[PDB]
Amino acid sequence: LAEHLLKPLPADKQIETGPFLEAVSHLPPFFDCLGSPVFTPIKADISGNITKIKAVYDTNPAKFRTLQNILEVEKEMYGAEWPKVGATLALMWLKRGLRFIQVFLQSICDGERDENHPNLIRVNATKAYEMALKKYHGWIVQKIFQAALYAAPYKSDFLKALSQNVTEEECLEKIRLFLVNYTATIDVIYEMYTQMNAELNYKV
Protein backbone atom coordinates (compact mmCIF):
# COMPACT_ATOMS: atom_id res chain seq x y z
CA LEU A 1 0.00 0.00 0.00
CA ALA A 2 3.10 2.11 0.66
CA GLU A 3 4.68 0.36 -2.35
CA HIS A 4 2.19 2.12 -4.63
CA LEU A 5 1.65 5.52 -3.11
CA LEU A 6 -0.29 7.99 -5.22
CA LYS A 7 1.71 11.02 -6.36
CA PRO A 8 1.16 14.24 -4.39
CA LEU A 9 -1.09 16.85 -6.01
CA PRO A 10 0.83 19.28 -8.24
CA ALA A 11 0.35 23.02 -7.45
CA ASP A 12 -2.42 23.51 -10.03
CA LYS A 13 -4.27 20.46 -8.61
CA GLN A 14 -4.68 18.85 -12.05
CA ILE A 15 -4.41 15.06 -11.84
CA GLU A 16 -2.49 13.37 -14.62
CA THR A 17 -4.62 10.58 -16.07
CA GLY A 18 -1.97 7.98 -16.95
CA PRO A 19 -0.25 7.90 -13.54
CA PHE A 20 -3.61 8.04 -11.75
CA LEU A 21 -4.82 4.97 -13.64
CA GLU A 22 -1.57 3.09 -13.05
CA ALA A 23 -1.76 3.91 -9.32
CA VAL A 24 -5.37 2.83 -8.70
CA SER A 25 -4.94 -0.33 -10.80
CA HIS A 26 -3.14 -1.73 -7.72
CA LEU A 27 -6.33 -1.59 -5.67
CA PRO A 28 -8.59 -4.28 -7.27
CA PRO A 29 -6.07 -7.12 -6.56
CA PHE A 30 -6.50 -6.60 -2.77
CA PHE A 31 -10.07 -7.87 -3.24
CA ASP A 32 -8.86 -11.38 -4.17
CA CYS A 33 -7.27 -11.71 -0.73
CA LEU A 34 -10.28 -10.83 1.47
CA GLY A 35 -11.13 -14.53 1.46
CA SER A 36 -14.54 -14.56 -0.24
CA PRO A 37 -16.16 -14.95 -3.71
CA VAL A 38 -18.65 -12.31 -2.53
CA PHE A 39 -15.96 -9.71 -3.42
CA THR A 40 -15.52 -10.85 -7.03
CA PRO A 41 -18.28 -8.57 -8.53
CA ILE A 42 -16.98 -5.66 -6.43
CA LYS A 43 -13.49 -6.07 -7.87
CA ALA A 44 -15.03 -6.34 -11.37
CA ASP A 45 -16.95 -3.08 -10.90
CA ILE A 46 -13.89 -1.07 -9.86
CA SER A 47 -11.57 -2.74 -12.38
CA GLY A 48 -14.17 -2.29 -15.10
CA ASN A 49 -14.35 1.46 -14.51
CA ILE A 50 -10.55 1.81 -14.54
CA THR A 51 -10.48 -0.09 -17.87
CA LYS A 52 -13.22 2.14 -19.36
CA ILE A 53 -11.34 5.31 -18.43
CA LYS A 54 -8.04 3.85 -19.66
CA ALA A 55 -9.62 2.90 -23.01
CA VAL A 56 -10.84 6.54 -23.47
CA TYR A 57 -7.37 7.94 -22.47
CA ASP A 58 -5.62 5.55 -24.86
CA THR A 59 -7.42 7.07 -27.87
CA ASN A 60 -5.67 10.39 -27.29
CA PRO A 61 -3.30 10.64 -24.27
CA ALA A 62 -2.57 14.35 -24.89
CA LYS A 63 -6.22 15.41 -25.17
CA PHE A 64 -6.99 13.36 -22.08
CA ARG A 65 -3.75 14.29 -20.25
CA THR A 66 -5.58 15.10 -17.04
CA LEU A 67 -8.83 14.02 -15.39
CA GLN A 68 -10.14 17.58 -15.74
CA ASN A 69 -9.41 17.28 -19.51
CA ILE A 70 -11.59 14.14 -19.65
CA LEU A 71 -14.62 15.90 -18.18
CA GLU A 72 -14.29 19.03 -20.28
CA VAL A 73 -13.50 17.22 -23.58
CA GLU A 74 -16.42 14.80 -23.15
CA LYS A 75 -18.82 17.61 -22.20
CA GLU A 76 -17.92 19.25 -25.55
CA MET A 77 -17.74 15.96 -27.51
CA TYR A 78 -21.05 14.47 -26.38
CA GLY A 79 -23.64 17.19 -25.89
CA ALA A 80 -26.81 16.29 -24.02
CA GLU A 81 -26.06 12.77 -22.84
CA TRP A 82 -23.10 14.07 -20.77
CA PRO A 83 -22.24 13.55 -17.80
CA LYS A 84 -24.03 10.18 -18.04
CA VAL A 85 -21.62 8.94 -20.76
CA GLY A 86 -18.04 7.82 -21.50
CA ALA A 87 -15.09 8.04 -19.12
CA THR A 88 -16.92 10.81 -17.15
CA LEU A 89 -19.54 8.31 -16.12
CA ALA A 90 -17.03 5.54 -15.33
CA LEU A 91 -14.91 7.94 -13.17
CA MET A 92 -18.09 9.11 -11.40
CA TRP A 93 -18.62 5.54 -10.18
CA LEU A 94 -14.91 4.87 -9.72
CA LYS A 95 -14.54 7.84 -7.36
CA ARG A 96 -17.29 6.40 -5.13
CA GLY A 97 -15.54 3.01 -4.94
CA LEU A 98 -12.27 4.80 -4.15
CA ARG A 99 -14.00 6.95 -1.49
CA PHE A 100 -15.48 3.79 0.00
CA ILE A 101 -11.97 2.35 0.36
CA GLN A 102 -10.73 5.66 1.80
CA VAL A 103 -13.44 6.08 4.50
CA PHE A 104 -13.10 2.40 5.48
CA LEU A 105 -9.31 2.49 5.87
CA GLN A 106 -9.39 5.84 7.68
CA SER A 107 -12.05 4.56 10.11
CA ILE A 108 -9.90 1.53 10.86
CA CYS A 109 -6.78 3.68 11.39
CA ASP A 110 -8.72 6.16 13.59
CA GLY A 111 -9.44 3.29 15.97
CA GLU A 112 -13.21 3.24 15.36
CA ARG A 113 -14.75 -0.01 16.57
CA ASP A 114 -17.86 -1.63 18.06
CA GLU A 115 -16.95 -2.02 21.78
CA ASN A 116 -19.32 -5.03 21.83
CA HIS A 117 -17.62 -6.66 18.80
CA PRO A 118 -14.02 -5.27 18.80
CA ASN A 119 -12.26 -7.53 16.23
CA LEU A 120 -14.89 -7.10 13.52
CA ILE A 121 -14.78 -4.47 10.76
CA ARG A 122 -18.53 -4.24 10.21
CA VAL A 123 -18.87 -0.77 11.72
CA ASN A 124 -15.98 0.54 9.59
CA ALA A 125 -17.41 -0.92 6.40
CA THR A 126 -20.90 0.32 7.27
CA LYS A 127 -19.66 3.88 7.82
CA ALA A 128 -17.76 3.78 4.52
CA TYR A 129 -20.89 2.44 2.78
CA GLU A 130 -23.10 5.19 4.26
CA MET A 131 -20.67 7.91 3.27
CA ALA A 132 -19.70 6.81 -0.26
CA LEU A 133 -22.25 4.49 -1.78
CA LYS A 134 -25.59 4.09 0.05
CA LYS A 135 -27.44 7.06 -1.32
CA TYR A 136 -26.79 5.84 -4.91
CA HIS A 137 -28.27 2.45 -4.28
CA GLY A 138 -31.91 1.42 -4.29
CA TRP A 139 -33.27 -0.85 -1.63
CA ILE A 140 -32.33 -4.21 -3.20
CA VAL A 141 -28.58 -3.46 -3.58
CA GLN A 142 -28.58 -2.06 -0.06
CA LYS A 143 -29.96 -5.40 1.12
CA ILE A 144 -27.24 -7.24 -0.80
CA PHE A 145 -24.54 -5.01 0.78
CA GLN A 146 -25.93 -5.89 4.24
CA ALA A 147 -25.66 -9.62 3.46
CA ALA A 148 -22.22 -9.24 1.78
CA LEU A 149 -21.01 -7.50 4.92
CA TYR A 150 -20.96 -10.83 6.73
CA ALA A 151 -18.23 -12.15 4.43
CA ALA A 152 -15.91 -9.48 5.92
CA PRO A 153 -12.80 -10.89 7.64
CA TYR A 154 -11.91 -10.14 11.28
CA LYS A 155 -9.95 -6.88 11.75
CA SER A 156 -6.88 -8.77 12.96
CA ASP A 157 -7.03 -10.98 9.88
CA PHE A 158 -7.66 -8.14 7.43
CA LEU A 159 -4.58 -6.30 8.71
CA LYS A 160 -2.39 -9.40 8.67
CA ALA A 161 -3.60 -10.06 5.11
CA LEU A 162 -2.35 -6.65 3.89
CA SER A 163 1.06 -7.67 5.30
CA GLN A 164 6.42 -8.66 5.70
CA ASN A 165 6.42 -9.70 9.35
CA VAL A 166 5.29 -6.46 10.88
CA THR A 167 3.23 -5.42 13.93
CA GLU A 168 -0.35 -4.37 13.57
CA GLU A 169 0.76 -0.88 14.67
CA GLU A 170 3.39 -0.82 11.87
CA CYS A 171 0.81 -1.96 9.31
CA LEU A 172 -1.63 0.82 10.34
CA GLU A 173 1.10 3.50 10.18
CA LYS A 174 1.75 2.34 6.59
CA ILE A 175 -1.96 2.60 5.82
CA ARG A 176 -1.97 6.15 7.32
CA LEU A 177 0.95 7.04 4.98
CA PHE A 178 -1.01 5.72 1.96
CA LEU A 179 -4.14 7.68 2.91
CA VAL A 180 -2.43 11.09 2.75
CA ASN A 181 -2.10 11.49 -1.02
CA TYR A 182 -4.93 9.01 -1.68
CA THR A 183 -7.42 11.19 0.26
CA ALA A 184 -6.18 14.45 -1.23
CA THR A 185 -6.54 13.03 -4.78
CA ILE A 186 -10.06 11.64 -4.32
CA ASP A 187 -11.10 14.88 -2.66
CA VAL A 188 -9.90 16.81 -5.72
CA ILE A 189 -11.85 14.46 -8.02
CA TYR A 190 -15.04 15.03 -5.99
CA GLU A 191 -14.46 18.79 -6.13
CA MET A 192 -13.99 18.53 -9.90
CA TYR A 193 -17.36 16.80 -10.27
CA THR A 194 -19.01 19.57 -8.21
CA GLN A 195 -17.42 22.46 -10.11
CA MET A 196 -18.22 20.93 -13.47
CA ASN A 197 -21.78 20.05 -12.40
CA ALA A 198 -21.01 16.47 -13.53
CA GLU A 199 -22.34 14.73 -10.44
CA LEU A 200 -25.53 12.67 -10.83
CA ASN A 201 -27.66 11.18 -8.04
CA TYR A 202 -29.53 8.45 -9.83
CA LYS A 203 -29.85 5.24 -7.79
CA VAL A 204 -29.22 1.72 -9.06
UniProtKB/Swiss-Prot annotation:
GO BP annotation list: ceramide transport; intermembrane lipid transfer; response to immobilization stress
Sequence repeat placement: 42-52, 53-63
Cited InterPro entries: GLTP_sf, Glycolipid_transfer_prot_dom
Region (2 X 12 AA approximate tandem repeats): 42-63
A GO molecular-function annotation: identical protein binding
Main location, first listed in the record: cytoplasm
Outcome following mutation: F178S: No loss of activity; 90% residual activity
GO cellular component terms attached to this protein's record: cytosol
Species of the source: Homo sapiens
Record annotation: effect of changing L133R: Significant inactivation; 5% residual acti vity
Protein name: Glycolipid transfer protein
Disulfide pairings: none
Family listed: Belongs to the GLTP family.
Subcellular localization(s) per the UniProt record: Cytoplasm
SUBUNIT field: Monomer.
Keywords: Acetylation, Cytoplasm, Lipid transport, Repeat, Transport
Protein's UniProt keywords contain Ion transport: no
Superkingdom as given in the UniProt entry: Eukaryota
Organism classification: Eukaryota, Metazoa, Chordata, Craniata, Vertebrata
Binding-site list for beta-D-galactosyl-(1->4)-beta-D-glucosyl-(1<->1)-N-[(9Z)-octadecenoyl]-sphing-4-enine: D45, I46, S47, G48, N49, I50, T51, K52, H137, Y202
